[PDB]
Ligand binder design. Structure first.
Ligand SMILES: [Zn+2]
Ligand SMILES: [Zn+2]
Length: 668
RNA sequence: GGUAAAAUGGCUGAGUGAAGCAUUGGACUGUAAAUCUAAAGACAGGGGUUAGGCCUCUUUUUACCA
């Protein structure tokens, strides 16, 4: 068979601040993805991108912005069931996939293949790419740029022209004639010879595109007029169709360079991706957030708006696909821009929703509570981000000066971005400590994303370095050490704390826990084992003023949690099914909503928050009846103070009305 | 919400083009059941490749998701 009939280039990352570079090219036979960071897990599977058929994955640089997201792809492939896959990258990239099995578990069932730098050539039936390793004085010094090529395309045969002369078109005799013409050998028929160009268009060798990743001036000198480029710059076998520059805007304006790119010729198109892009590609999420704000602006805050030299450049944006083989031109028929003026149309006119909203407002229309005890909910999914659900983070802000994290995950940084707005830089500075509940990957894979950005935030205002405090099981230390020794230096920003020492009845550890307690003004900190998995642990917070909150998360009912949870103003509990099957508890290793409600009733706590929900089937939580005002429903991007309890019970009717039709488990 | 198998008629087996059971008048049979020389409904709804078999976007059915 011949080469692909159509080739499309698609942009995934779009140069967003919350994620690294990422480029997607669609081919008739194979799917290829270049580079990927954190937050892409939603970008794909939200814009209808097929996970399957991604047998080949490519990436650049070892930094988390381009290697962090591989765990999600591996997990999806394991769930998807793809038989084989191929992964390529820097020579020392095998160490990254060596340590994934530590917590993600064995990858047996799907085969992954890697290759060294000794084989810089790879070919298949529809495409070919050449990789050029690059060495720089100032592994973070290797970026290995990529080059792409396309197989020759055979010009369409003129079957109608053959029929006009008198050839036996429409039968089995024409097939050998067209097959011979395809090979390029003329055939003489009826005493006359017909040239190939007469019966078909001239062959086209095929276009190509190049990708570069110059991050700073360290890599400019090694790449300056590279030998490989001299054999392809300017006129070549075919003109260059498109080019993408991942370099930052600062590198663009430098006097040096900015002229080599022009050597490719005016016909060569160029693109730039960087943080200055307007983006705004959260249509459905933004609509849901606006609806929640309309229900009650105070309870549910609103996301902030993230808004925006010899040849022209088309700034990259959302789903700016490019067409290669049919014709070299751009397409913008899939623009994804938020339109609140359209969101309000359906937010203020849902069936019976307006009546419930107005009734709740009239009903709403007991002394002032404490001003700045704050708990913020970031994510309410389970190990799989989706339209409106993602791995939970449970941001807590005990005081404006000091902040704490109730576990963390991937995509939480993107969530708090476009939300805190200008205050994002200040919020990260207030962060003083973090910790992990159990060994699940989704609960600890988000630490690097927060840490690397907090490192920049600390210097953004010229404050002294303050290493972050991390409390996680002793197993998490191995992965952190491997990453420190393999990809980038992060040890100085993390201080491990075993959770065993915090158990009831159990110099560096004591001084560090004392510093944590005094910095955030916490009277005491306690942790206990949970019936969830090996080395699983919980936590409890008690304030000097008598406020107590205990986080349980994934856990089966146990006596220790109940004993520690006695006289607790608030607590976070996990739900799996609401109403349904009570069997196969061992498979889930999680509590049940009815049992959670019973516990909360007997917990003596005045209110119980339901945050973590299983995401096997996309459905709003069908709240189990036989409950009280103590229980509640927790979603993403929530706000209020400690004493703002009486508000949320009245939000139940409007909250249910907003969803209207519910898509829950059916007999199928 | 995601993954896996079929969209051909009253039913099924496939991709050179379509075939058996059944029927419209019945021939051997007083009798309407046995055996045909003719008949018919015909590959879900779009398009990219210029041909069906390939891929792509909804629609129906079944199963699975830790
Ligand atoms: Zn969980
Ligand atoms: Zn978990």
């Amino acid at each position: 068979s011949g080469g692909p009939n159509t080739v499309y280039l698609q942009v995934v990352a779009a140069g967003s601040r919350d994620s690294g570079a990422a480029l997607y090219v669609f081919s008739e036979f194979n799917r290829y993805l270049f580079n990927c960071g954190e937050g892409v897990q939603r970008l794909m599977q939200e814009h209808k991108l097929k996970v399957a058929r991604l047998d080949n994955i490519f990436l650049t640089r070892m930094h988390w912005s381009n290697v962090g997201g591989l765990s999600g792809m591996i997990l999806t492939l394991k769930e998807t069931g793809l038989p084989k896959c191929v992964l390529s990258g820097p020579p020392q990239l095998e160490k990254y996939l060596e340590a994934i099995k530590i917590f993600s578990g064995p990858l047996k069932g799907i085969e992954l293949a890697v290759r060294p730098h000794s084989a810089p050539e790879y070919e298949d039936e529809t495409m070919t790419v050449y990789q050029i390793p690059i060495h720089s004085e100032q592994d973070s010094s290797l970026v290995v740029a990529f080059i792409c090529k396309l197989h020759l395309k055979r010009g369409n045969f003129l079957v109608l022209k053959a029929k006009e002369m008198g050839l036996p078109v429409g039968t089995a005799a024409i097939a050998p004639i067209i097959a011979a013409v395809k090979d390029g050998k003329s055939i003489t028929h009826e005493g006359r010879e017909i040239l190939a160009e007469e019966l078909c268009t001239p062959p086209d060798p095929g276009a190509a595109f190049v990708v570069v990743e110059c991050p700073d001036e360290s890599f400019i000198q090694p790449i300056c007029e590279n030998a490989t480029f001299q054999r392809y710059q300017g006129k070549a076998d075919a003109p260059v169709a498109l080019v993408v520059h991942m370099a930052p805007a600062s590198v663009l304006v430098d006097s040096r360079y900015q002229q080599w790119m022009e050597r490719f010729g005016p016909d060569t198109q160029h693109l730039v991706l960087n943080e200055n892009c307007a983006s705004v590609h959260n249509l459905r999420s933004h609509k849901i957030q606006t609806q929640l704000n309309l229900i009650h602006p105070d309870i549910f805050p609103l996301l902030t708006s993230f808004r925006c030299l010899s040849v022209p450049m088309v700034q990259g944006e959302c789903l700016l696909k490019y067409q290669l083989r049919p014709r070299r031109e751009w397409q913008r028929d899939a623009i994804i821009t938020c339109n609140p003026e359209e969101f309000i149309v359906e937010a203020l006119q849902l069936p019976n929703f307006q009546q419930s909203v107005q009734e709740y407002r009239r009903s709403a229309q007991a002394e002032k509570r404490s001003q700045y005890p704050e708990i913020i909910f970031l994510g309410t999914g389970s190990a799989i981000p989706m339209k409106i659900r993602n791995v939970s983070a449970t941001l807590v802000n005990i005081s404006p000066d000091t902040s704490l994290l109730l576990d963390c995950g991937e995509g939480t940084f993107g969530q708090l971005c476009r939300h805190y707005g200008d205050q994002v830089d200040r919020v990260l500075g207030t962060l003083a400590a973090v910790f992990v509940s159990h060994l699940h990957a989704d609960h600890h894979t988000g630490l690097p994303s927060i840490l690397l950005q907090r490192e920049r935030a600390l210097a953004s205002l010229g404050k002294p370095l303050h290493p972050l405090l991390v409390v996680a099981p002793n197993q998490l230390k191995a992965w952190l050490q491997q990453y420190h020794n393999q990809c980038q230096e992060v040890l100085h920003h993390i201080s491990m704390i075993p959770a065993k020492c915090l158990q009831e009845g159990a110099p560096a550890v004591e001084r560090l826990i004392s510093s944590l307690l005094r910095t955030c003004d916490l009277e005491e900190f306690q942790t206990c084992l949970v019936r969830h998995c090996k080395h699983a642990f919980g936590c409890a917070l008690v304030h000097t003023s008598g406020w107590k909150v205990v986080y349980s998360g994934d856990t089966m009912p146990c006596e220790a949690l109940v004993r520690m949870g006695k006289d607790a103003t608030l607590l976070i509990h996990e739900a799996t099914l609401e109403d349904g099957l009570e069997e196969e508890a061992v498979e889930k290793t999680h509590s049940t909503t009815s049992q959670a409600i019973s516990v909360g009733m007997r917990m003596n706590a005045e209110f119980i928050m339901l945050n973590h929900f299983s995401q096997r089937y996309a459905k709003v939580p069908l709240f189990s009846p036989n409950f009280s005002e103590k229980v509640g429903v927790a979603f993403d991007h929530m706000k209020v103070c400690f004493g703002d309890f009486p508000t949320m019970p009245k939000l139940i009717p409007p909250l249910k009305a907003l969803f209207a039709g519910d898509i829950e488990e059916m007999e199928e």
